[PDB]
Amino acid sequence: KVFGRCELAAAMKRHGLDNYRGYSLGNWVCAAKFESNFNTQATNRNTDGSTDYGILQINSRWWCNDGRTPGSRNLCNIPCSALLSSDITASVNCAKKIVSDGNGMNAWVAWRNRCKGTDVQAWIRGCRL
Ligand code: NA
């Protein structure tokens, strides 16, 4: 399931992301756009033994358990399966932890390299949330 941009924006806002730890809603929609093109089923399996999962491409080396990633670390305390739902509950809850347990949204390579320093509110203005 791909989300439409404004549908996702509304869902993210209704899960508390608009201005979360200083990141306006547009940051999160932009991150999703460039991490996964809004695809809840996106998966990127890596040579280090980790995999990036779901709409925010959260990486299994640190944040979720998929039963096979070296170190078996799970800082969001979720199965990586929960990051592949059209239910964004786990992706949102885990993203909040990531931003609190580190150097903010720099955890997301696509945010850092595509969304940072831009007018990220462009991604949500037309939704009028
Ligand atoms: Na893991």
Domain definitions of the chain by residue range: 1-129
- The protein residues having their C-beta less than 5 angstroms from ligand 1 (an ion) are 60, 65, 69, 73
CATH 1.10.530.10 fits 1-129, yes or no: yes
Does 35 participate in catalysis according to the annotation?
yes
Q: Which residues of 44-61 are buried (b: 16+ CB within 10 A; e: fewer)?
A: eeeeeebbbbbbbbbbbb
Distance CA 72, CA 40 (A): 23
Q: Counting beta carbons within 10 angstroms of the beta carbon of residue 100, is it exposed (0 to 12), middle (13 to 18) or buried (19 or more)?
A: exposed
Resolution in A: 1.1
Q: Residue 45 Cα, ligand 1 centroid: separation in angstroms? A: 13
Query: Are residues 6 and 127 in contact, defined by beta-carbon separation less than 8 angstroms?
Result: yes
Q: Which residues of 6-41 are buried (b: 16+ CB within 10 A; e: fewer)?
A: eebbbbbbebebbebeebbbbbbbbbbbbbbebbbe
Solving technique: X-ray
Does 18 participate in catalysis according to the annotation?
no
Beta pairing partners, 65: 79
